Ligand binder design. Structure first.
Ligand SMILES: NC(=O)c1ccc(S(=O)(=O)N(Cc2ccccc2)[C@H]2CNC[C@@H]2N(Cc2ccccc2)S(=O)(=O)c2ccc(C(N)=O)cc2)cc1
Ligand SMILES: [Cl-]
Ligand SMILES: [Cl-]
Ligand SMILES: [Cl-]
Lengths: 99, 99
């Protein structure tokens, strides 16, 4: 699709079999979801937000669908203001900014 | 332009006679710049996300040029770690997400 930005670009994602609402965030380098169960081992990751850096859990090679587009990549889990699809997965699904 | 998300979508803007680098950020409702002077009235606001909240000054009806595109809108000014062009101005230059 072509998504305008008059409203937040909230889309449905599917991960671990569940539908969730997430924000397409080109300012986020990474993908960070609210606390959830993901398979496997995780590694530590620091993400720098507006108020400073925080520790989150990094899970690699996770299947996630974004508006029906299948992706497999790194998903961080932590206390994000909203589920966020950041550039790692936006790139994967072929998303660009256009004006 | 069509801007890839392999890297951060950093652009040059011109605001208040200053040339700055800023991130095209679809996750940001409003534009947020590092401390600078702007003309006119302002009112305080708090904005936040990962790591917490910061206080900013909200200036409305500010002229920004983004990639040669003029746009008018609110600019939040405060101790942000990165200059952000949010949806309030992305819309004005006709910026969309595309995949
Ligand atoms: N209310 C408003 O207008 C408003 C609020 C908040 C801001 S913001 O400054 O925080 N801002 C820009 C920014 C800040 C720091 C670095 C790059 C970009 C958010 C938009 N894009 C990412 C930011 N974040 C996501 C977010 C915050 C709030 C609402 C929706 C989305 S986040 O939680 O800092 C985060 C950071 C980084 C990562 C990562 N590494 O993936 C994930 C999450 C601007 C405006
Ligand atoms: Cl840890
Ligand atoms: Cl990835
Ligand atoms: Cl505005």
């Amino acid at each position: 699709p072509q998504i305008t930005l008059w409203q937040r670009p909230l889309v449905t994602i599917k991960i671990g079999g569940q539908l969730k609402e997430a924000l397409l965030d080109t300012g986020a380098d990474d993908t960070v979801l609210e606390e959830m169960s993901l398979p496997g081992r995780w590694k530590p990751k620091m993400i720098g937000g507006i108020g400073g850096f925080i520790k989150v859990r990094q899970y690699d090679q996770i299947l996630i669908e974004i508006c029906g587009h299948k992706a497999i990549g790194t998903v961080l889990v932590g206390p994000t203001p909203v589920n966020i699809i950041g550039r790692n997965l936006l790139t994967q699904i072929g998303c660009t900014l256009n004006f």
